[PDB]
Every structure is written in structure tokens, then in C-alpha cells.
Design a protein around this ligand. Structure first.
Ligand SMILES: CC(C)C[C@@H](N)C(=O)Nc1ccc(-c2ccnc3[nH]ccc23)cc1
Lengths: 339, 20
């Protein structure tokens, strides 16, 4: 048995070694069979693929270099790959291979067949407080880990939380994650999840991730987010107004935790104070949570997705399938040299 | 109800990230 201080110290030594000497060019597109698109958007696409050499399935994130440049995501993309190849935690999807070709950048991660929390939460409607707390404890531990390595995650939401066959969470999508000791200023995130200090264009720090945890716990427990509207500008007005309403079925403990996470005043927001994450972990809402048992995956999960077989994609929606075009000329060579 | 207001809203599907 070791302390958390001691676990994190060793975790930092492990991380820094990979951070300072990143892995590069560890596979080639030709080793993979394409099966199905799992997600798309202007920010890239993710495809289910099979590795011929092992028969393993993977989730391959594909980014078009020229579109990354037009979206001003060059440095964010180098961040994502550099950080992901360096981290190691039970609730983070693992990066298995990365490489690039003339046209695209590729990150090959482990495939999580249970799907996004997003789809289960929306169908079922809402999670019970014990169910929500099980998931929230995993994010609390993950943020403890990431934050200790000077990493900010900046995109927590149900869309980015996959449910594995044991019913535990895997965080995916590190496209806005960043290693920063001071403050930082980029406008990024998702509207419903943005802290007031992002909206107000202040320099901000890892406290934005703790605010986003409050939004997530609310959304999981209520079935809808604490600030919603038809357009983002209207969401921002609600977020900065300083007001929140809880459902009557929320426990007293839950409301009190959420008041301290959805706290506009940075000198008062849980996560950010002298006692750090322990203000959260020692809160009464988490009194039943055995943090080691969660880290060890020894707790029985409240929900187990349906298996159906290796490669089955039923727990994911259908997307339009698009070619993987590889130009015969190298694009953006300088910009992505370190990838 | 707040649920009905959310369900009638245009932001009940997967949400994209923002950027400037
Ligand atoms: C890529 C974005 C810029 C586009 C976004 N809209 C999106 O689709 N993200 C997304 C994230 C994870 C998966 C996924 C599904 C199953 N198992 C998995 N293992 C590891 C990742 C994974 C699929 C899609």
C-alpha cells in the first residue's frame, strides 16, 4: 500500500520520460482494415479499424492536416498526441500507435465497444445519485492524476466518456488538453461546460475542469445541463448570471457539492483552494466512495453495456462514410514535423 | 417542466466544441 503522494510522484517520473522523448511513427495506414465511422465533425473523424497483424480492433482518429491548419488547431493537435502518448491511468483511453502520411494524422486508440455515456444518459433519461457518483468518482481521480502532471483537460462532457465492458469510464478526446503551469487564455471547450472565466476572456487555470465536473454531475443526475438554451450566446448569459436551479429530487448533499463546484468566485470553488482535490473527495456526497476501490476497478458497476461481439457497433450511431484521401504530395510538413 | 423544455430544445444531441 502507498500514499497518493507517492503514487503521483512515481506517475510523474513515468510521464516526464515519455513527455520529453515522445513516440513517433509507430504504424502505417496499410496495417489496418477500415470497418465503420464512429464519429465525425469539422474537428476530425474516428473510425473502427482492425489491425491485420493481431486481429485486434482499434478506434483510429483521423485528422486532415489542411483542415487542422485552417481551424488554427496546429499546436492543439501536437498537444493531444504528445500528452496522450505520455499518460497512463485506468480511466484514460490508451494511445497504441500514431503516424502521419502526406495528407492526414492518425491516432490509433483502444476500442471501447460500450459507447458514449452521452447515448445511454439521453435514452435512459437520468442516472440515480449512486450511479452518477460512481462515474463522478472516476473523473475526480482522473483529474487528480492529470492535474498533478500540470495538464488541463478542457473538454469534459458525456460525449467524451466511453463505457467499457466492465461498466467503467474511459475518457477520450484530448484535442484541447494542455501542459501549462501558469494561466492560459484560449477560448475552447463546449458551451454548456464552459466556466465563467473562460467566457469572460480571463486568464484561467485547472479550476475550469472542476467547474466542468459540476456541470457533468448535474447533467448526469438531472438528465439535462444546468445552463441550457437554443443558442450558445444565451447559454453564456445563464452561466455568468450567477444563478442555478436544482431539481427537487436532488439530495441536500448533492446540491451542496454542486454549489461549491459551480462557484463563480475562484477563491471559493472546490478543487482550487488550499486543500485542493480533497475538498471534493472528503465531501459528504462522496462519504460512501472507496477511492482506492474505484481506482482498482473493484467496485461493481451500476450498468454494464451489451456485448454482442468483437467489432459490433450497435452502441454507436450511423455516420456518412467518407474516403481516406492521401495526396501524392506532402502537405503541411513543417507544421506537423514533430507528430 | 424543465425536462420538457430541454427535450424541445435544439441542443439535445451530441455537442460540438467551440473555438475562435
Ligand atoms: C474525433 C473528434 C474530433 C470528432 C468527435 N465528434 C468524435 O466523434 N469523437 C470520438 C471519440 C471517441 C470515439 C471512440 C469510440 C469507441 N471507442 C473508442 N476508443 C477510443 C475512442 C473511441 C469515437 C469518436
Amino acid at each position: 500500500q502507498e500514499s497518493v503522494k507517492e503514487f503521483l510522484a512515481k506517475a510523474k517520473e513515468d510521464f516526464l520520460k515519455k513527455w520529453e522523448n515522445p513516440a513517433q511513427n509507430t504504424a502505417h495506414l496499410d496495417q489496418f482494415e477500415r470497418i465503420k465511422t464512429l464519429g465525425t465533425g469539422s474537428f476530425g473523424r474516428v473510425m473502427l479499424v482492425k489491425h491485420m497483424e493481431t486481429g485486434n480492433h482499434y478506434a483510429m482518429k483521423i485528422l486532415d492536416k489542411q483542415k487542422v491548419v485552417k481551424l488554427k488547431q496546429i499546436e492543439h493537435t501536437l498537444n493531444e498526441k504528445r500528452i496522450l502518448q505520455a499518460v497512463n491511468f485506468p480511466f484514460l483511453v490508451k494511445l497504441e500507435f500514431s503516424f502521419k502520411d502526406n495528407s492526414n494524422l492518425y491516432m490509433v486508440m483502444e476500442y471501447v465497444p460500450g459507447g458514449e455515456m452521452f447515448s445511454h444518459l439521453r435514452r435512459i433519461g437520468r442516472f440515480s445519485e449512486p450511479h452518477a457518483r460512481f462515474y463522478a468518482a472516476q473523473i475526480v481521480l482522473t483529474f487528480e492524476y492529470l492535474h498533478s502532471l500540470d495538464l488541463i483537460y478542457r473538454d469534459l462532457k458525456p460525449e467524451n466518456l466511453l463505457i467499457d465492458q466492465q461498466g467503467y469510464i474511459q475518457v477520450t478526446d484530448f484535442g484541447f488538453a494542455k501542459r501549462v503551469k501558469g494561466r492560459t487564455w484560449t477560448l475552447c471547450g463546449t458551451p454548456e461546460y464552459l466556466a465563467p472565466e473562460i467566457i469572460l476572456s480571463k486568464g484561467y487555470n485547472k479550476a475550469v475542469d472542476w467547474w466542468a465536473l459540476g456541470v457533468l454531475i448535474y447533467e448526469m443526475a438531472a438528465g439535462y445541463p444546468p445552463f441550457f438554451a437554443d443558442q450558445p450566446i444565451q447559454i453564456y448569459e445563464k452561466i455568468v448570471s450567477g444563478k442555478v436551479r436544482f431539481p427537487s429530487h436532488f439530495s441536500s448533499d448533492l446540491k451542496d457539492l454542486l454549489r461549491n463546484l459551480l462557484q463563480v468566485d475562484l477563491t471559493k470553488r472546490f478543487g482550487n483552494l488550499k486543500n485542493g482535490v480533497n475538498d471534493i473527495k472528503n465531501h459528504k456526497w462522496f462519504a460512501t466512495t472507496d477511492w482506492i476501490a474505484i481506482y482498482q476497478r473493484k467496485v461493481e458497476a451500476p450498468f454494464i453495456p451489451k456485448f454482442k461481439g468483437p467489432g459490433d457497433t450497435s452502441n454507436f450511431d450511423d455516420y456518412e462514410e467518407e474516403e481516406i484521401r492521401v495526396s501524392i504530395n506532402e502537405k503541411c510538413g513543417k507544421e506537423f514535423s514533430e507528430f | 417542466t424543465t425536462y420538457a423544455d430541454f427535450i424541445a430544445s435544439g441542443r439535445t444531441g451530441r455537442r460540438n466544441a467551440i473555438h475562435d
